[PDB]
Amino acid sequence: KSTIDAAKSMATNVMKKFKKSGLANSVSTLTDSLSDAASSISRGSSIR
Amino acid sequence: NSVTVRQDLERQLGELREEFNALSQEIAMSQLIDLALLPLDMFSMFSGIKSTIDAAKSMATNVMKKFKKSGLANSVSTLTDSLSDAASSISRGSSIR
Amino acid sequence: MASLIYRQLLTNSYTVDLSDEIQEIGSLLDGPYQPTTFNPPVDYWMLLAPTTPGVIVEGTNNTDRWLATILIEPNVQSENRTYTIFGIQEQLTVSNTSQDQWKFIDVVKTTANGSIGQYGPLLSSPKLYAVMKHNEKLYTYEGQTPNATTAHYSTTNYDSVNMTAFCDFYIIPRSEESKCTEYINNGLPPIQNTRNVVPLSLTARDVIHLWKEMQYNRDITIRFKFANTIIKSGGLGYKWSEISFKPANYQYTYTRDGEEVTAHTTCSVNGMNDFSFNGGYLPTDFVVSKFEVIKENSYVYIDYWDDSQAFRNVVYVRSLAANLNSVMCTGGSYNFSLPVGQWPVLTGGAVSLHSAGVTLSTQFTDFVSLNSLRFRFRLAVEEPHFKLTRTRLDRLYGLPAADPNNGKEYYEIAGRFSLISLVPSNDDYQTPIANGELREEFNALSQEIAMSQLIDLALLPLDMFSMFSGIKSTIDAAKSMATNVMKKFKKSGLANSVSTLTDSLSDAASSIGSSASAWTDSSVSTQTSTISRRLRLKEMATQTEGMNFDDISAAVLKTKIDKSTQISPNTIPDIVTEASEKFIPNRAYRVINNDDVFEAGIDGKFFAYKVDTFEEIPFDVQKFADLVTDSPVISAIIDFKTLKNLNDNYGISRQQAFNLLRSDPRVLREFINQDNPIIRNRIEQLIMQCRL
Amino acid sequence: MASLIYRQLLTNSYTVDLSDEIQEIGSTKSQNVTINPGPFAQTGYAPVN
Amino acid sequence: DVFEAGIDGKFFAYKVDTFEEIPFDVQKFADLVTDSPVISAIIDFKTLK
């Protein structure tokens, strides 16, 4: 609504804190778990 | 204020290929299929990479700089160019059947 | 599908802001110049920057008042100093409390030979002065830094004021006022921001400057120098103020297998360090304010120009690369001049230079403008020690800005540079060595494109890479090609339509359908036409099945871009913006509900029919509005006229018709292969409409 | 699904030039760095003849 | 009818309900591959059979 002067960095600024909160951490942990499961050979069938 | 330390070098690409080829056995099947099911992206690719230091340059862009000169990019470019030339009413040559 | 190119175009457009920010950083000072006489026009400012004590600048009237400027260094208490004001010597009282910032004072004579006073208190670390003359009043800087104002006076003969300076000054128009304060209150601006980098002769007109590729792979032998600026502070020579690096010039000759090539080079340094050797607070002791030394976080630039068959084709560059070989530079002794006792001596200091970039540059010698090559050099610290004896300064590395010449009058750099230039070759001969109607042409070219290949291309989606990967580009302009088209696209008609739809949808969270919704807001014809015009925006909602109109528009745009040659890189955004909107005003949409089909046209057509035998069905606007809100929508490439003519004149099976209502590419292309005149007519009528 | 990354690598390809637009500008208008001397007296001997 | 072809230089045609082979024709494959959606078959013809 503000409709203010020449282009700002609103998208970048909001992304800066959107990539630090819990969503990014959760997706990182999910990817790490999937990678470790794909690498799960030194223990056989071990993932609970 | 010390003389710059000589920057370290990189493991030989031949040794890299040998190591990657030797790593074949240590891969599971069903878990790999399920991981392939999950979509990835630039943020999900380097979660275990780009260790948190105040000197990184978002290595995704470093990959992008080296990815436009690979075979895939040129193949896509020439395929699109051939499609455009065909759509541009090209007088086909005799050897073009 | 191929429509995705539109969706991405408005998606990443936000990135332009970042580039725009950089653009505002890149959005320019004219100077410096030799101290001479001239008439700087009105609406122009004077950004003076002296360093040596003396009479700074004076504006002569010979009928009106006398204006004089005196610069006073710190570390001088209440004493009397002599200057040369207008050629007549005069004494002035000076009293300074600041220790690291110099001070300017204005001297005003009420007439040509009036009384003498001292006023206009200015304190600044970069030692910068601003004077303006506009609208029947003279402006001069007044007020303590950083934020200040302008003193205003009104004295006759404004436009005839000719101010003779004795330092380096910049001339700036009014619009860069926000720049000026930012370039006055925030330290000495970097030299690379200047237009005429070398302080040589002044010009008020300097301008920054089907084909065939030409390759030039030659060799260079660059010989370059450095330049020091030394000033002595107040007192009796017991202390100095600034020993800094300044741009230098060198013109020489060499051999290149026969040719006496004349190479003109200019040097500059940026991002230097300033070591502070702060002496005792007593008035009589060796004190140095700033010692400028070069370290790892500082760079040196060299601008290289020479006549050659390679350098005469540089105005348009396709590719550029550097393969220089590093060269070491070592400094020499620099002995100070202390009147009493043993003067300090600087020794040591050595660095190395390596190449990490190259681009175009501007250089002038007397009145000849040049298109030079700027080579960027990174620096490295080395083994030799650098110390200041007779004091406590020891164990530092770098290279001082005192005597880097080291006796040698040139530093040699030998390497090979390869560049590719674009030359206008209207044929395959007569290649030069030295350096609207497009609307009609685009509209006329749009009658000969094939159809099957068009459909094939519309099947394969595009992206931000395939759009410009088939068109040749100049490396200087290819940097900002996606950025400009996205900036122009974010101000397109489709952008306004999507913004209005989003605003209306959000406002709706506070007609002709069943209830209130953001899509239900010859009378039947007009209402249906409005509904269709609003529904056109559904093509950005990814809620379509099969091919769509925007895919065909993108495909024809790509084909005509590839075929055309009369379009400049500055012209692509306008063509894309106009084509994304004006293309195909006659759009048709159809929706399916319980074996019934309703179709509406933008032009005012509306029909309804069944899928079994294509029987005409009376039109019900209410159910159409009820269902089109949230349901699959398919672009009606095959509308009811073509479908009925096909079902009558040709014996098609049920699968073909059902896929046609879904616009399946396979059956449509099969019909194209069969070369049915009705489908050819429909496709050709659709294609002919694609024009600006 | 995952193959998107490759389709993503082309997607932002143009941005690599943007990266150059950083460095090609970053080195040009690089700003001076100031050094802070230790808050202790430095000068010793007076001018000795 | 399902037409499966590879890069090594071998091709096959068969039927969906029952797994037995039918003669192959180049024309139909060339027409289909132009517009028809291609499926990345992890389990190839040999393994499926």
What are the DSSP calls for C116-155, one per residue? ---EEEEEESS--EEEEE-SSSEEEEESSSSS-EEEEE--
Cβ-defined contact of A9 to C18 (cutoff 8 Å): yes
- Mutation pick from C1, C451, C454, C459 vs chain E, by most beta carbons of E within 10 Å, is C459
Nearest CB neighbour to B89, from listed C381, C397, C450: C450
In angstroms, what CA-CA distances link C297 with C142, C397, C623?
A: 36, 13, 71
Assign C234 to helix, strand or coil. coil
Structure-block tokens of residue C485: 């088209």
Backbone angles phi, psi at C454, to 5 degrees: -60, -45
Q: How far is D33 from chain B (nearest CA, A)?
A: 14
Peptide bond into C146 cis (omega under 30): yes
CB atoms within 10 A of CB C127: 22
Residue with tokens 């690409």: B13
Q: Which of C120, C125, C124, C123 is nearest to C139 (CA)?
A: C120
Residue B78 touches chain C, beta carbons under 8 Å: no
- Joined tokens for residue C242: 């600034």
8 Å CB contact of A9 and C16 = no
Rounded distance, CA C455 to CA E34, Å? 10
The tally of CA atoms less than 13 A away on the side-chain side of residue C5 is 29
Choose among C296, C397, C456: nearest Cβ to B83: C456
Q: What is the CA radius of gyration of chain E?
A: 11
User: Can you read off the two tokens belonging to residue C246?
Assistant: 């300044």
Contacts of C509 (CB under 8 A, 6+ apart): none
Nearest to C401 by CA among C334, C466, C303, C468: C334
Chain B CB within 8 Å of residue A15 CB: no
**Separation in Å, CA of C130 to nearest CA in chain A:** 28
Q: Do chains C and A touch (3 or more CB pairs under 8 A)?
A: yes
Yes or no: say if C358 and C304 are a contact pair by the CB < 8 Å rule: no
Are the C-beta atoms of C464 and C482 separated by less than 8 Å?
yes
Torsion of CA C498, C500, C506, C510, to 10 degrees: -160
Chain E partners (3+ C-beta pairs within 8 A): C
| Residue of C452, C478, C194 lying closest to C319 (CA atoms) | C478
Give the residue on A whose Cα is nearest the Cα of C20: A7
Residues paired with residue C303 on neighbouring β-strands, in sequence order: C266, C374
CA distance linking residue C678 with residue C670, whole number of Å: 14
Write down the residue that tokens 């005597």 correspond to.
C403
Three-point CA angle C9, C14, B84, nearest 5°: 20
Spatial distance between the Cα atoms of D28 and C356, rounded to a whole number of angstroms: 13
Solved by what technique? cryo-EM
Task: Check: CB of residue C580 under 8 Å from CB of residue C6.
Answer: yes
B34: helix, coil or strand? helix
Give the minimum alpha-carbon distance from C419 to chain E in angstroms, rounded to a whole number: 40
Cβ–Cβ under 8 Å, residues C56 and C50: yes
Residue of chain B whose Cα is closest to the Cα of D7: B41
Cβ-based interface (< 8 Å): residues of B facing D = 35-42, 45, 61, 63-65, 67-68, 72-73, 76
Q: Give the tokens for residue C683.
A: 């496709």
Q: Which residue type does C359 have? A: T
Q: How many DSSP H helices and E strands does chain C contain? A: 16, 34
Coil/strand/helix, residue D29: coil
User: Per the CB < 8 Å rule, is C20 touching A6?
Assistant: yes
C665-674 vs C654-662: helix crossing angle, rounded to 10? 120
Residue C13: CB atoms within 10 A of its CB come to 21
Q: Do A12 and C24 touch (CB under 8 A)?
A: no
Q: Is the CB of residue C349 less than 8 Å from the CB of residue C398?
A: yes
Integer Cα distance of C355 and C299 in angstroms: 10
Give the tokens for residue C545: 């099945």
Vertex C353 angle, CA C352 and C358, to 5°: 175
Length of chain A: 48
CA angle C463, C359, C355 (to 5 degrees): 110
D2, D8, D13 member nearest B38 (Cβ): D2
Chains that touch D (3 or more CB pairs under 8 A): B, C
Residues in chain C: 692
HSE of C114, CA atoms in CB hemisphere, 13 A: 15
H-helix segments, C543-630:
549-563, 572-582, 621-628
How many other β-carbons are positioned within 10 Å of the β-carbon of residue C611? 14
Whole-angstrom distance, CA of residue A10 vs CA of residue A3: 12
Angstrom distance (rounded) from CA C631 to CA C262: 74
**Letter for the amino acid at C443?**
N
Query: What single letter denotes the amino acid at residue A48?
Result: R
Q: What are the Cα distances from residue C112, in Å, to C65, C67, C83? A: 6, 10, 17
User: CB pairs under 8 A, 24+ apart, for C101-104?
Assistant: C101/C74, C101/C125, C102/C71, C102/C72, C102/C73, C102/C74, C102/C127, C103/C71, C103/C72, C103/C74, C104/C56, C104/C69, C104/C70, C104/C71, C104/C72, C104/C129
Closest CA to C348 of C328, C327, C332, C329: C332
Segment (H or E) for C66 = strand C66-72
> By the 8 A CB rule, do C64 and C75 touch?
no
Which value in Å is the resolution of this experimental model? Answer: 4.7
Residue C356 phi/psi, 5-degree rounding, is -140, 45
Pull the structure tokens for residue C304. Answer: 């290289």
Are C550 and C539 a contacting pair, CB within 8 Å? yes
C369: β partners: C364
Counting runs of H as helices and runs of E as strands, what totals does chain B give?
Answer: 5, 0
CB neighbours of C619 closer than 8 A, spacing ≥ 6?
C524, C598, C606, C607, C608
Helices (H) and strands (E) in chain E, counts: 2, 2
User: Locate tokens 């600024």: which residue?
Assistant: A13
Tokens coding C451: 């159809």
Distance from CA of B45 to the nearest CA of C (A): 20
Give dist(CA C397, CA B3) in Å, integer.
Answer: 7
Rounded Cα gap, residues C554 and B68, in angstroms = 23
Cβ contact (<8 Å) for D42 and C277? yes
Residue C507: CB atoms within 10 A of its CB come to 9
Nearest by CB to B88, from C395, C460, C563: name it: C563
Strands E11-14 and C399-400: unpaired
For residue C32, cis peptide bond before it (omega within 30 degrees of 0): yes
Q: How far is D3 from chain C (nearest CA, A)?
A: 15
Per-residue buried b or exposed e for C259-273, using 16+ beta carbons within 10 Å of the residue's own CB: eebebbbbbbbbbbb
CB contact at 8 A, C51 and C218: no
Q: How many CA atoms within 13 Å lie on the side-chain side of C158?
A: 17
* CA–CA dist C499, C493 (Å, integer): 10
Do residue C340 and residue D47 have CB atoms under 8 angstroms apart?
yes
Breaks (C–N over 2.5 Å) after residues, chain B: none
Distance from CA of C81 to the nearest CA of B (A): 42
A40 vs A46, B71, D2, CA distance in Å?
8, 33, 20
> Tokens in use for C98?
């600041």
Q: What is the 3-state secondary structure (H, E, C) of C419-472?
A: EEEEECCCCCCCCCCCCCHHHHHHHHHHHCCCCHHHHHHHHCCCCCCCCCCCCC
Across the interface, of C398, C449, C462, the residue whose CB is closest to B88 is C449
Spatial neighbors of C276 by CB under 8 A, at least 6 apart, are C288, C289, C290, C291, D35, D37
Task: Map C618-671 to HEC letters.
Answer: CCCHHHHHHHHCCCCEEECCCCHHHHHHHHHHCCCCHHHHHHHHHCCHHHHHHH
Could you tell me the strand order of the sheet in which C369-381 lies? C248-255, C260-270, C299-306, C369-381, C350-364, C327-330
Phi-psi region of C561 (alpha: psi -120 to 50; beta: other; left: phi over 0): alpha
Interface test with C, best of D27, D34, D36 (most C CBs within 10 A): D27
- What's the CA gap between E36 and E16, in Å, rounded? 17
Q: How many CA atoms lie within 13 A of C120 on its CB side?
A: 24
Sequence-separated (6 or more) residues with CB below 8 Å from residue C613:
none
Question: How many contacts (CB atoms, under 8 Å) link C and D?
Answer: 103
* Long-range Cβ pairs for the range B9-13 (8 Å, 24+): none
Residues of C with CB under 8 A from a CB of A: 14, 16-18, 20-21, 24
* b/e map C647-658, b = 16+ CB within 10 Å: eeeeeeeeebbe
CB C192 within 8 A of CB C266: no
H-type helices in C176-250, by residue range? 177-184
Q: Judging by beta carbons within 10 Å of its beta carbon (0-12, 13-18, 19+), is residue C95 exposed, middle or buried?
A: exposed
> Which residues have C-beta within 8 Å of that of residue C377, sequence separation ≥ 6?
C299, C300, C301, C302, C353, C354, C355, C356
Question: How far, in Å, CA of C158 to CA of C148, rounded?
Answer: 24
Rg (CA), chain B: 22
Closest CA to B29 of A38, A45, A46: A38
d(CA C661, CA C340): 102
Put simply, the answer to whether D11 touches C478 (Cβ < 8 Å) is no
Nearest 10 degrees: Cα torsion C118, C119, C125, C127: -70
Q: Which residues of C touch E34 (CB under 8 A)?
A: 456, 669
Judge whether B87 and C451 are in contact, CB under 8 Å: no
Q: Give the nearest chain C residue to E33 (CA atoms).
A: C666
Say if CB C190 and CB C269 are below 8 A apart. no
Q: Extract the tokens encoding C433.
A: 């060595």
Question: Token match 């990479």: residue?
Answer: B49
> Which residues are registered as beta bridge partners of C634?
C590
As a whole number of angstroms, the distance between CA B27 and CA C43 comes to 73
CA atoms within 13 A on the CB side of D23: 13
* Letter string b/e over residues C367-400, b meaning 16 or more CB atoms within 10 A of that residue's CB: eeebbbbbbbbbbebbebebebeebebeebbbbb
